UniProtKB/Swiss-Prot annotation, chain A:
Encoding gene (name): PRPF8
Tissue specificity field: Widely expressed.
Entry protein name: Pre-mRNA-processing-splicing factor 8
Region span, Required for interaction with EFTUD2 and SNRNP200: 235-269
Entire protein: shown range: 2067 to 2335 of 2335
Subunit structure: Part of the U5 snRNP complex. Component of the U4/U6-U5 tri-snRNP complex composed of the U4, U6 and U5 snRNAs and at least PRPF3, PRPF4, PRPF6, PRPF8, PRPF31, SNRNP200, TXNL4A, SNRNP40, DDX23, CD2BP2, PPIH, SNU13, EFTUD2, SART1 and USP39. Component of the U5.U4atac/U6atac snRNP complexes in U12-dependent spliceosomes. Within the minor spliceosome, which acts on U12-type introns, interacts with PPIL2 and RBM48. Core component of U2-type precatalytic, catalytic and postcatalytic spliceosomal complexes. Found in a mRNA splicing-dependent exon junction complex (EJC) with SRRM1.
Organism: Homo sapiens
From Swiss-Prot, chain B:
Included range, full protein: 405 to 1942 of 2136
Gene (UniProt): SNRNP200
GO molecular function: ATP binding; ATP hydrolysis activity; helicase activity; identical protein binding; RNA binding; RNA helicase activity
Record-given protein name: U5 small nuclear ribonucleoprotein 200 kDa helicase
Role played: Catalyzes the ATP-dependent unwinding of U4/U6 RNA duplices, an essential step in the assembly of a catalytically active spliceosome. Plays a role in pre-mRNA splicing as a core component of precatalytic, catalytic and postcatalytic spliceosomal complexes. As a component of the minor spliceosome, involved in the splicing of U12-type introns in pre-mRNAs. Involved in spliceosome assembly, activation and disassembly. Mediates changes in the dynamic network of RNA-RNA interactions in the spliceosome.
Disease: Retinitis pigmentosa 33: A retinal dystrophy belonging to the group of pigmentary retinopathies. Retinitis pigmentosa is characterized by retinal pigment deposits visible on fundus examination and primary loss of rod photoreceptor cells followed by secondary loss of cone photoreceptors. Patients typically have night vision blindness and loss of midperipheral visual field. As their condition progresses, they lose their far peripheral visual field and eventually central vision as well.
Modified residues (Phosphotyrosine): Y305
Native source organism of the sequence: Homo sapiens (Human)
All copies of domain SEC63, residue ranges: 577-882
Localisation per UniProt entry: Nucleus
Amino acid sequence: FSSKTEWRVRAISAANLHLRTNHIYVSSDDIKETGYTYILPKNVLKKFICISDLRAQIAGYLYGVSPPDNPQVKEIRCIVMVPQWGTHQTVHLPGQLPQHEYLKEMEPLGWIHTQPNESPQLSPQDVTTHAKIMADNPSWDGEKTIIITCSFTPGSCTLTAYKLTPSGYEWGRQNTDKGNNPKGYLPSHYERVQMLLSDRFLGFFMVPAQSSWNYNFMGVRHDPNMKYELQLANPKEFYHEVHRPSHFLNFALLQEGEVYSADREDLYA
Amino acid sequence: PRQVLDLEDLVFTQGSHFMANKRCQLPDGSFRRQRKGYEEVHVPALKPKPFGSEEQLLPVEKLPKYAQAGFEGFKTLNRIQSKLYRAALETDENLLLCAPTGAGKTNVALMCMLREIGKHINMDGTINVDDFKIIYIAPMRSLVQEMVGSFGKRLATYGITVAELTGDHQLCKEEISATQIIVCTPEKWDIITRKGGERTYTQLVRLIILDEIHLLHDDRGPVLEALVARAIRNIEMTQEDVRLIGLSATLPNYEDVATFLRVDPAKGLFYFDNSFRPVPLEQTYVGITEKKAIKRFQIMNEIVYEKIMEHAGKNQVLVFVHSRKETGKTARAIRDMCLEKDTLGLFLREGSASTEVLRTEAEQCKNLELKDLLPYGFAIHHAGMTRVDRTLVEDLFADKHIQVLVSTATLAWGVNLPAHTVIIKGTQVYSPEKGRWTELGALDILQMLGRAGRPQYDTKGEGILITSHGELQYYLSLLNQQLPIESQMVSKLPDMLNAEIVLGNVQNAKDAVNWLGYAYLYIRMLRSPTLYGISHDDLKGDPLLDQRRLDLVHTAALMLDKNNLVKYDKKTGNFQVTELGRIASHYYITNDTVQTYNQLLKPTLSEIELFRVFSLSSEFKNITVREEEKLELQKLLERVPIPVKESIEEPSAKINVLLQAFISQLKLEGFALMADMVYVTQSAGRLMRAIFEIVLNRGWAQLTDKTLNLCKMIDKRMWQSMCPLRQFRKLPEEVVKKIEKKNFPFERLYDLNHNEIGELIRMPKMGKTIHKYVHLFPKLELSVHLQPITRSTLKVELTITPDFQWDEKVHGSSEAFWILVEDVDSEVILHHEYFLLKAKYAQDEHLITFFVPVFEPLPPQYFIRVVSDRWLSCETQLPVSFRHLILPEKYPPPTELLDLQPLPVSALRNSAFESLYQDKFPFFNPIQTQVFNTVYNSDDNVFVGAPTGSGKTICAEFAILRMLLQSSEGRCVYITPMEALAEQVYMDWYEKFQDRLNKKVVLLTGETSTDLKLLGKGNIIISTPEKWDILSRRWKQRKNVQNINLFVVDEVHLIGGENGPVLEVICSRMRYISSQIERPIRIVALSSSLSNAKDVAHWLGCSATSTFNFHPNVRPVPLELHIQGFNISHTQTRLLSMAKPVYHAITKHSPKKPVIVFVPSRKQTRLTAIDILTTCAADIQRQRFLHCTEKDLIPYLEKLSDSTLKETLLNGVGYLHEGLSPMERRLVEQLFSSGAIQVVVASRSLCWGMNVAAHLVIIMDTQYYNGKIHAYVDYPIYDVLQMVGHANRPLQDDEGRCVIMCQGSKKDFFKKFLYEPLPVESHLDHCMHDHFNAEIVTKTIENKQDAVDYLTWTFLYRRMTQNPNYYNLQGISHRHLSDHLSELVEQTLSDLEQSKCISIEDEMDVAPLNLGMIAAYYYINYTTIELFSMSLNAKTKVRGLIEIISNAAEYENIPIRHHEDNLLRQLAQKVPHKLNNPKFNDPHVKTNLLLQAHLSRMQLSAELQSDTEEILSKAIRLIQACVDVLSSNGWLSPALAA
């Protein structure tokens, strides 16, 4: 990245993300009609869209449950943001899975991540990351977890849900190439699962305790094996002050200053 | 009639520089000559006026003795002071002293303060400091800061505290309360008055000294205009005289100035022209004429050098410049010119001593630039250099070693070192406010020339003024008594009108014009209409200028309405304050700026848009970005963190980058740029505070958090991502930056040890200091407990625990926090409130209870945050979780008031019964009509829920009649929670039943001996819950308690209040008796409309066809409720601000009808009555509240003892409080009922014992000071409902109006709970032990299973199935309910056994013990008897036994109010027995003191005797318990003593 004025322009662009949050499109096509259905609360959806960036992808774990006497539908009741740094085509989450008391009552349902532009297929990077997470963590059942992709289309956010088939799981768990077009990736590895919005219930967020979630500016400080404790709160903004300490802290002090400054009495105080 | 004016056209564009006299005549010897490219004009040193044949400098040994100690070292007085000392010491008359600058006006001001001080001498002592305050208004901040020291030194002998007004609003109010001589600037005093912080001491402010009042010409002139107009109008309305002393410069229009000051032209008006200047000054002027500024500046340099040469070897020179850098620049410049011309030695000739002193001080100097000049005769002096160095310069000049001081105006203002010669260089200053190069002001010019001529050494001053030729005339007129003073109020008229409207002084256009008349502008327009855009035609048309004043008011109101600062109607001309206007007035923001904010601010702004919005403020409208600074602005644009959307060529972008640079602490180079930085920062403080207030009021959580952070960030000059240890200014920047580099969350440091932190930061030397400072950092701990109240409202009890070491030097008197309760998304505030943590109450828990609404989509959590109001990163958050919250079921609908026909009196059966309803009403109100067929015609237990004043007593009477019809020898027991209400009802039914129906009614008292006789004798037994519990506790023995027939319970809705569990237990016991005694004790319950009435009906035995729960909108008389929010966190200030609103509401709603005003305490009543009368007198409608004539008042006014009450009643206002005797209470009540007096101001505690109903009910400040916790606890909703129900006049009034003026915090709570019916819960779990022990001794409880069965009867048990979370329950399941019941009963039984009041065998059987039997016998708290049995030994005595009694837990409720501690301390020193470690906050020590006082029959205050009677009520039973317990123990001498 340029990192000199590109971040300035991107911050200015991200300041208008809340306009996208009223033009949302759901891709209801190629859905197999046989799997689960998923319900995403609009409050957490809008907060996630607002706190994101137009270029560097962000991602967060989903937790949810099933409504009483309706186990084939799953309500997403929580989103967890973890110390991460991402590029325009991938997100480098830490190996540790979220662990907290409140989450113990909900069953993990996958993860949701942003996309700079819409694409008609699940990317090799996303499939391999999903497979790696599932293999590393036994709690991630391959039939209930999914991937939710939010693509920033012109003046809108298009949401699409994808599920990983066993063949894709094996290919991802074995693959090691992080390039855009690895070998052995086929459209049979994933399938579309039905996802819809809901105004009837509200979900919540969970952010790290000691630090914030966005490390993009503090890239060096992040490690995949980093450990973190959670906390019940709401996320900050991508370009929040805490997330870019360099811009605010790299200044200098005052030495012999205010010596030739103007004289103006603050009469009111 | 009204006409819109062109206000901006009318204003004077030059403001302070505006010229009013077209001519400028100079004295005789005032030649002029054209030298070269400039004109030299001369004016000679005015010859002093010869001393009058009978005027002299009288010595200080002649003025009054109390005024001598203020003059220390002063042998004679100046001529002016000797002239007017008689006026300034012997009379309280308003003065206008016109004297030259530097003539000793401060000494005259000291004379006036000495008069005000000698009024209070404290003969045996020295001074009564706390009875008066004096305001001294000086125009410059440096001048204020130096007057503070001067007057403190002068008046130190009196112990008078002289202080400057500074700091936040809380700090300023504390300073006012703590000090006497308040020195302040006009702006500072105006802003404190607008915010109302001094409202508590304006009465004690007995004098204002407006120093240098020629400021009226300046753009600051409107400030003094508003100050004086407000002071004069307050004097006239409230009639509390305040003395005005105008110290003015010798200039024209002083007659108009005296008129504006209400100063007599004969006595209070004097004139001391420039001739009287103590050191006459030859004033010369060099007007440069060339039209190119480069040559003008070069000629300026040459001329300053020439004038320095003029007095090079003769006298000292004070050269005056504009900028700090220009100071050294021109000083070095003149040094170099004299060096080039070889005139450097003239200044420092071979004066070995002086030259060596200068050289040594230079070589010691730490300032390099000043070190470069001290070796020679030149020096610099500006505020930007070290304090040590500037005092060094000052003392050197005072020693006369330096020959030329180059300085700016701050020296001339704040330090009085007068030099022989003064040279003003150029007089051109860069004003950022106007955004250009403008001219010096009159005030600054006059002060800087005042130093010309030292009175000690100098015999003639020499003032050179080097200016431009065109401007020469302005300064000549200023300095030759030819600058007439002209009001600039047209510039800021809308602002002052808004300020007055917000303060409530002016309500409609009429009052606005009345105020405008007083203003200085009015006098100027009246005298000279042309100068102010008015024609002599207009003047003749409106000789008082009323039409022009009305037009100005109309224009100002139109501007305010267009910008939405006031709701102004052109029809009636009335004004309504908007919250936007409140903020604008409090923070001095301009109407254009506040409109811009109202248009731009949105909930979704970011930290990028916030800076843009702040920059777009109109205050910077004049600031324009110039190209010369554009490259540096670009550099700042690159370095500033927050991106700038604008392009750098916009002034908005300029302000953005300048503010970011200031916060970032960068250093700039361009002088104009630093001037703009200073200006924008000083404006930004207030502007950002105002924006924060706006967003907070509109409830935007994200944006209010952002703006509060930004305000604190500007104040602390540090980004909030830095290390919070910078805020401690004593710490080394190197160590704070080391901590910043080692970036970890700050909270990490708290858990560590001082060595631990020292090694983490690698600074073991600093480790201890860092540990001390981190622990000094403020920190709070929050613990929340929440109970669902209804399906739409919770109750949150939040405990705040400090976690830091208080330290006055860093924290001070108080610490301010904001408590914000916001929803799950943290985007709307549900409840914001202030919180003051005073030093006195540190290291202890603080409870903060509030009601937060909960909406249909039950959110997973809410968030409660406490954020400091001053410190950065001092935040704590707590998520309140609704995971296990069980919301009670939504209450059923009320029994609709079916439209029955009016029930006729013939509907009743018995003629003797009708006899007592015939002449009162021919028909019963619809409530009685409906309820009659169930009460009289049906026998089941009945519940009647109707709004207070609905005649529920008449339905109860129907029930009594039905019982009497069943059998004349029945027995009705009428239980009433309050004894006063019991007395009222006893009177009513004694006149109703016994006198007419010949049926006995007996009112039980607290004497069980005669209570049984009365119960067995009478037929209507009036009782209170406790006086009847003392009977029913032995119901098995008392057959009279068994063979009852009717149980009427009055307002059972008072079950969920203090002492409510007693009523609950007696009612449940009666139900159980009825169930066992073979004949139902039919029960009739009366209540306010209860939401949860089904449960109480089920508990009491009612049927769903006998439950009658109506709605608060079912009262026979409709009610108009109005709740007024007063967002004043301070309680006394809110109380005093509500006074005028009370009168306004009385005028608006009930102009000619009865009004009752309920005030919190016993003292507030008199003050409220006096205030309402004072405001009604200020208005022309005096005695308007006396519907009768004074002829009819003497027979009643002669029976009263309170002289002030007699005065208020004569004027037409009565008042009532417990301190008054019953005779007086009844007399005022009779007067009010008859209608002789309109307004009655009654105590809060009296809302229950009142035999009167009014048309209008006003409620004040629904809180009262509980001193046990030192907190202002809210009114109980039961009492508030009683107050509002008192607004019940059935026949005389078509409607009843009630206005409650409450804090905005409780506004929503009242709005919620006063319109809908009232849910009620039980509070028995906490007061369980007493009644449980009573039943145990009665043997109703014999094993824990029977205990659970007994609990299954209480109303508590019913609610533990519908609202479990209220009782710490976690489920309505049978398991959960049984487990909670078992836990509660086991806990209570264990505690009782520990007290030894019971004995538990097999952990399953309970048996009584002696302590339990005694406690149940004489109705003592089990805890109290435990304390007695433990503390009472075989060798106690009366001296200690009084203490043991005072420790009884029956006195924990004795009221501890404010001002109650000092007189209690006085009492402690006179009683026969002394108290060990007596903490007068303690009810037990208080009760011991009052017991001893009663025994010694000493004089007591009325309020103290009120509590003494309450103490003595239970003292007899307590001492009886003492006797019986000592009997059980077997201790003869202690029993004898008891």
